[PDB]
Amino acid sequence: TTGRIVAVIGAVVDVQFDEGLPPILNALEVQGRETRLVLEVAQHLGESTVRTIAMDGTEGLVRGQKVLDSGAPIRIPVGPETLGRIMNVIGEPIDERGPIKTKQFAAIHAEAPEFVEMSVEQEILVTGIKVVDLLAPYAKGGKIGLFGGAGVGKTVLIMELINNVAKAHGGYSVFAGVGERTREGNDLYHEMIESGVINLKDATSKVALVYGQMNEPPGARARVALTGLTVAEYFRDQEGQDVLLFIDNIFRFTQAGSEVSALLGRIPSAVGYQPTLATDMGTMQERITTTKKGSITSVQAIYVPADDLTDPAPATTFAHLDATTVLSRAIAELGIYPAVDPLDSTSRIMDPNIVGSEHYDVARGVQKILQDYKSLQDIIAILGMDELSEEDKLTVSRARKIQRFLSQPFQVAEVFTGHLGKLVPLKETIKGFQQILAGEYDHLPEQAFYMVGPIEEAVAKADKLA
């Protein structure tokens, strides 16, 4: 029926109920507030008290303050009316464009598609990005993860993917801001209005926006992912459609969970994280999937705290991905953009039977020459180039030209590169590296391979170096 707040600590609120006890996952509505304050039931503590997590600030709450059970979990608008609109964790519009008037509402908690619902089909999604398409290619309807420490290029890479992949997509898209910059949301939104994927007059908008950024309390950041994901689920199933789902940044979900976990009275796990890190991520990630009923192509930016890939949060995310793009601060600092670690990024479709033996061979070849170069670097750092056999000097020179030809000017990063953004077709990516490996440009200088599109541009750049 009606409950009373008995305890408040940050995002965690205990509520006592006299008659009916709301089940775990139910959305409670705090009475006597100017803006809607939802608490989600996390635990039954005993003695007719439940422990909850607030979806907004808890300043101003008093013990004894009344709370009503809504009778269900947080429910949000889904369907066409979400398109072009921006909503928050609890499905309220946040774009000042009035109510989002939908027929259907869907709960932000749901079970993951069963085993029999899985799709086993594999098809390359070509991005026009050289290092990705060659070494760790994306798959249509696949799970894609972009790993990177602070400032290394996650958001740039996701925006270039929206440019290169979303632009020419005949379905719907969903962008979920999770614990990132509010001004980035403002950037994305106005950019989409300028391009017309979002239309403020028509019903031709192709992208739905969900935001719970780093200005939100943990409860909100811990749940916006589920909200954004729910919007995507509708489109996948109730339209049987091809859906794009961009999330920046999914790490913020796990960090958010971490902030409230102590307040929920859990004994902490490794590095102070919640003991439930892997299952919380499992129940959330396993919903982000293509099913027999429909395809979700997902791209998730994944922050890596203190540049540590063994940190529980990123470490646990790897197994949820069909393709990983790992960005590296050391690679970035060398000026190589996108700062992809070509030996730490993998794809489940990098298989001769899927991509063909030529694509596969050139990739394995590039990777071998890069690994051989890497093994020689201790010797190089102390003694230098001059102590290498002629065979080693050749691996070094070819590898260094290959490293440079993996770099690419992004349309989205033109201000920073000082070059025009480029998109290289797959066949031309394969050919360029096929040729560098064959020794065909051992006569050309390193710098010629840096920040260009196709191999022809490298040649023409070498000529221009007079």
Partner: protein, 54 residues
């Protein structure tokens, strides 16, 4: 002419190798002390968490 060129170049190569080594030392020292501090802190947190859970 040859040994005059050789002893200059070996003097230079050895100069550069000694300077590179010196940087690699300072860098590995900083790594060592970051790892030193983490091991101590990690070990303490394991202890604290065990005690607190009693």
């Amino acid at each position: 002419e040859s040994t005059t060129s050789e002893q200059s170049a070996r003097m230079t190569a050895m100069d550069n190798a000694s300077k590179n080594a010196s940087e690699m030392i300072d860098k590995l020292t900083l790594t060592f002390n970051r790892t030193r501090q983490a091991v101590i802190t990690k070990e303490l947190i394991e202890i604290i968490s065990g005690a607190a859970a009693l």
